[PDB]
């Protein structure tokens, strides 16, 4: 059936792996093992359509960000993740936006801005601030929690729906 190539990007430790693993394997990864480049595949029915999701979990740490550009090349949609308790991760979203533009050589790439770790109380990035950023890119802003699963499916499914509008 239809295959959707999704790519998760964002600063180190924002929760890219936890989000992906919660979506695909249904459990929360409590420990922090820096990622180099991992891929996941799973058949799911979205809006009545049986589709194959190929999700690339990329490195947020520069030290593990080797040929990251090459892996992302085939990506059809991207989740740009920051953590609501990490202001710097939010401020650096533009870096990932720029990288995506380069790898895809396009200004119109399906995307979703994700504010992860919404279960944490030390929030320094208010929803409104993220909504303004997303609005400027013309993309949806969705908050998630890889820990409680809140907004997790919504984030990935919305990305599929954005690819469909593409």
Ligand X SMILES: Nc1nc2c(ncn2[C@@H]2O[C@H](COP(=O)(O)OP(=O)(O)NP(=O)(O)O)[C@@H](O)[C@H]2O)c(=O)[nH]1
120 forms part of the interface with ligand X (CB under 6 A): yes
**Is 146 strand, coil or helix?**
coil
CB-count burial class (<10 Å; 0-12, 13-18, 19+) for 102: exposed
Positions at the binding site? 13-18, 29-35, 59-60, 116-119, 145-147
Handedness of CA 67, 69, 74, 79 (dihedral sign): positive
Q: Report which DSSP code applies to 96.
A: H
Nearest distance from residue 13's CB to Mg ion, in Å?
A: 8
120 binds, among ligand X, Mg ion, Ca ion, none (CB under 5 to 8 A by kind): ligand X
Residue count, binding to Ca ion (CB under 5 A): 2
Nearest distance from residue 83's CB to Ca ion, in Å?
A: 19
108 forms part of the interface with Ca ion (CB under 5 A): no
17 forms part of the interface with Mg ion (CB under 5 A): yes
Between CA 35 and CA 78 the distance in angstroms is 17
Nearest distance from residue 66's CB to ligand X, in Å?
A: 13
**Is 116 strand, coil or helix?**
strand
> Where along the sequence are the contacts to Ca ion (CB under 5 A)?
31, 33
């Amino acid at each position: 059936m239809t295959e959707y190539k999704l790519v998760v990007v964002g600063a180190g430790g924002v929760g890219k792996s936890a989000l992906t693993i919660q979506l695909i394997q249904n459990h929360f990864v409590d420990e922090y093992d820096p990622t180099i480049e991992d891929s996941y595949r799973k058949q799911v029915v979205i809006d009545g359509e049986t589709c194959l999701l190929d999700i690339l979990d990329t490195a947020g740490l520069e030290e593990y960000s080797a040929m990251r550009d090459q892996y992302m090349r085939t990506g059809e949609g991207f989740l740009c993740v920051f953590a609501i308790n990490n202001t710097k991760s939010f401020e650096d979203i533009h870096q990932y936006r720029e990288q995506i533009k380069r790898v895809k050589d396009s200004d119109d790439v399906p995307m979703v801005l994700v504010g992860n770790k919404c279960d944490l109380a030390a929030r320094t990035v208010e929803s409104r601030q993220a909504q303004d950023l997303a609005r400027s890119y013309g993309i949806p802003y969705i908050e998630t929690s890889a820990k409680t699963r809140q907004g997790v499916e919504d984030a990935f499914y919305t990305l599929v729906r954005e690819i469909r509008q593409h």
